[PDB]
Scaffold this active site. Structure first.
Site, mmCIF file in Angstrom:
data_model
loop_
_atom_site.group_PDB
_atom_site.id
_atom_site.type_symbol
_atom_site.label_atom_id
_atom_site.label_comp_id
_atom_site.label_asym_id
_atom_site.label_seq_id
_atom_site.Cartn_x
_atom_site.Cartn_y
_atom_site.Cartn_z
ATOM 1 N N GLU A 158 -3.226 13.464 2.028
ATOM 2 C CA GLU A 158 -4.427 12.986 2.777
ATOM 3 C C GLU A 158 -5.221 14.456 3.438
ATOM 4 O OE1 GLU A 158 -3.261 9.403 5.158
ATOM 5 O OE2 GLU A 158 -4.162 8.547 3.439
ATOM 6 N N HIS A 181 0.755 -1.254 0.058
ATOM 7 C CA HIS A 181 -0.185 0.025 0.030
ATOM 8 C C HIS A 181 0.874 1.145 0.166
ATOM 9 C CE1 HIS A 181 -3.618 -2.454 0.818
ATOM 10 N NE2 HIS A 181 -2.912 -3.171 1.925
ATOM 11 N N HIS A 217 2.209 9.169 1.778
ATOM 12 C CA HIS A 217 1.025 8.888 0.759
ATOM 13 C C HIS A 217 1.064 9.885 -0.299
ATOM 14 C CE1 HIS A 217 -1.197 6.878 3.909
ATOM 15 N NE2 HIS A 217 -0.555 7.602 4.745
ATOM 16 N N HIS A 230 3.876 11.056 7.368
ATOM 17 C CA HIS A 230 3.368 10.490 8.487
ATOM 18 C C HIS A 230 4.677 10.066 9.393
ATOM 19 C CE1 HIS A 230 -0.854 10.501 6.751
ATOM 20 N NE2 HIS A 230 -0.600 11.564 6.903
ATOM 21 N N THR A 274 -5.329 6.659 9.052
ATOM 22 C CA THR A 274 -6.008 6.965 7.684
ATOM 23 C C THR A 274 -6.024 5.403 6.863
ATOM 24 O OG1 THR A 274 -3.884 7.312 6.700
ATOM 25 C CG2 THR A 274 -5.085 9.252 7.864
ATOM 26 N N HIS A 291 6.347 6.689 6.905
ATOM 27 C CA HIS A 291 5.817 6.409 5.306
ATOM 28 C C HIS A 291 5.172 7.671 4.777
ATOM 29 C CE1 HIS A 291 2.127 5.869 8.066
ATOM 30 N NE2 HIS A 291 1.618 6.601 6.967
#
Ligand SMILES: [Zn+2]
EC number: 4.2.1.1
Length: 255
Positions: free
Chosen positions: A102, A60, A92, A115, A194, A90
Site C-alpha cells: 500500500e 478481503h 496486503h 500491518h 486503508t 494482516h
C-alpha cells in the site's frame, strides 16, 4: 466494497466520503522530502506476552486477532504518547512480485505489506479508539521476495484451513516478533485506515527495512479466495489501496 473493477478503491468515496479526506492512507514516501526529526524516540515493541487467538479469512484479507484485554503486546515510544495494544495483524499483497504494498517508497511497490494494528489504551476499547485522531498506531512492514521468513511459516501452514471467506481457525501461541526486520528505523505520518471505514485515526509507523519472504510463501497467500465456499472462485490478490495525496502532511524520519 472490495478491490475489483466495480467495487474497488476508486468507488469507496460513494459510501465512505472520508475516502477524499485530508489525511488518507496509504501514501508514497518520497525519501528525499521526508524530514529527519532528531526528537523522535526509538520505537518500543514489547510483544513478549502476546496472546494470539485465531486466524480469519475476512473476504478481503486474513486477520490474526490477539487478546487486547491486558497490556500483553504493546507499542510505545517513537512518535507516540502512551501505550498502544496489539489487536491484530494482516497483510496486503499482489498478483505479481512487483506490486502488493500500500505504501510506496519513491514510487517503488513491494510484493506485500504487513500491518500490525494497535490502539491507544486511554480510549478503553478499539471501537472508541478508531473515533479519535490519535486512536490507532499501525506498524507497516514491507515484504520483498527473496529468502524465506521463518517466523511467517506457521501463518503460511494454516492458510489451507481458511481458504474461503468467513473461515476461521485456532491460532494460539503465535509470536509476532518473528515478523520484524532487524532495524526499527521508521517513517511516520498522520493518516487513516486503508480500508473502509477509512477513519482518520492512525499514526502510521512504516519501517525502513523490509522483510524478505520466499516465492513459496507469497504464492500460498495468492491461493486464498475472496469468495465464500460454493461461490464462484476468485483468487485473493491485489487487496491494496493505491497511494493517496499527501495534502497538508509532512512525513518524518527517525534516521
Ligand atoms: Zn492493512
Amino acid at each position: 466494497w472490495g478491490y475489483g473493477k466495480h467495487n474497488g478503491p476508486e468507488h469507496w468515496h460513494k459510501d465512505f466520503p472520508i475516502a477524499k479526506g485530508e489525511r488518507q492512507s496509504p501514501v508514497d514516501i518520497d525519501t528525499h522530502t521526508a524530514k529527519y526529526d532528531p526528537s523522535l524516540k526509538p520505537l518500543s515493541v514489547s510483544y513478549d506476552q502476546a496472546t494470539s487467538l485465531r486466524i480469519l479469512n475476512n473476504g478481503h484479507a486474513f486477520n490474526v486477532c490477539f487478546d487486547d484485554s491486558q497490556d500483553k503486546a504493546v507499542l510505545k515510544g517513537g512518535p507516540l504518547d502512551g501505550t498502544y495494544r496489539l489487536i491484530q495483524f494482516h497483510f496486503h499483497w499482489g498478483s505479481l512480485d512487483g506490486q502488493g504494498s500500500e505504501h510506496t517508497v519513491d514510487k517503488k511497490k513491494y510484493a506485500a505489506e504487513l500491518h500490525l494494528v494497535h490502539w491507544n489504551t486511554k480510549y478503553g476499547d478499539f471501537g472508541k479508539a478508531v473515533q479519535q485522531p490519535d486512536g490507532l498506531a499501525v506498524l507497516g512492514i514491507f515484504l520483498k521476495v527473496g529468502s524465506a521468513k521463518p517466523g511467517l511459516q506457521k501463518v503460511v501452514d494454516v492458510l489451507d484451513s481458511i481458504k474461503t471467506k468467513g473461515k476461521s481457525a485456532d491460532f494460539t501461541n503465535f509470536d509476532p516478533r518473528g515478523l520484524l526486520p532487524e532495524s526499527l528505523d521508521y517513517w511516520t505520518y498522520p493518516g487513516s485506515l486503508t480500508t473502509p471505514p477509512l477513519l482518520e485515526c492512525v499514526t502510521w509507523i512504516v519501517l525502513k527495512e523490509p522483510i524478505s519472504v520466499s516465492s513459496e510463501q507469497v504464492l500460498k497467500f495468492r491461493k486464498l479466495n475472496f469468495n465464500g465456499e460454493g461461490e464462484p472462485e476468485e483468487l485473493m490478490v491485489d487487496n491494496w489501496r493505491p497511494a493517496q495525496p499527501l495534502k497538508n502532511r509532512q512525513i518524518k524520519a527517525s534516521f
